[PDB]
Every structure is written in structure tokens, then in C-alpha cells.
Amino acid sequence: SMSDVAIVKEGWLHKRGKYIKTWRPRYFLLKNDGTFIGYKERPQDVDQREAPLNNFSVAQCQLMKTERPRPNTFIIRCLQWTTVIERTFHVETPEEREEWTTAIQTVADGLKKQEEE
């Protein structure tokens, strides 16, 4: 339950439009349970956390790193019921990128191990 109610990583990143190719600021939270919730601003109190901007599952995903159109870009491709969603993000260093990427992967491995048994 409670590990399964925790926050793995949170912080700001750039999120690119699907179609309108602009980077936009989002405060994101990586949850143990596999949800990835994003916000316009860093969610102030608890009450603000309850109106998110972005919401997807990242248990069952591919973590890909790219250097276009910006260095330290990454793409998350994650299964979402019957379809995949792909989302493109950006951070200032490859080391930040590598930390975000490794943390997402940590959440997914957590749950792949639970599905196995």
C-alpha cells in the first residue's frame, strides 16, 4: 500500500506538444503506482494536486533519449489500455535526463516484478 502510495521523483521539465511543436513548462510527479501527473505550476497545497494537467500510466513503457530538436530530450512511449501514448520531454542536462529516465524505469520494474509473481 504505502510504498505503493509514494513519490519516486518530482520536478520540472519541458513538455513538447504532440502537434504544435513547442516546449511547455510542467511540474511532474512520478508515482510508485505508475501514474505520471503533470501541472501548470508546482502544486501548492494538497488541494491543488487535485486538478492536474496531464495524467498517464508509465508501467509498461519505453524510455528513449534523443538529441533533436534539443539535446537532453527524451521520449516516453507507454501502453494506455489498448493504445500507446508517446510523450516528448526536455531537461537541461543529460544527467538530469538520465535520472528521470532511470527513475521511470525503476517504477516500471517494480510493477513488472509484481506482475511476474
Q: How far is CA 19 from CA 16, 22, 87, 115, in A?
A: 9, 9, 11, 34
Contact between 64 and 75 under an 8 Å Cβ cutoff? The reply is yes
> Interface with ligand 4IP includes 90 (CB under 6 A)?
no
Positive or negative: CA dihedral 42, 47, 53, 54: positive
Among 18, 49, 65, 112, binds ligand 4IP (CB under 6 A): 18
| Min separation Cβ 46 and ligand 4IP, Å | 21
Q: Which of 1, 7, 19, 82 binds ligand 4IP (CB under 6 A)?
A: 19
Question: Least distance (Å) from ligand 4IP to the CB of residue 20?
Answer: 4
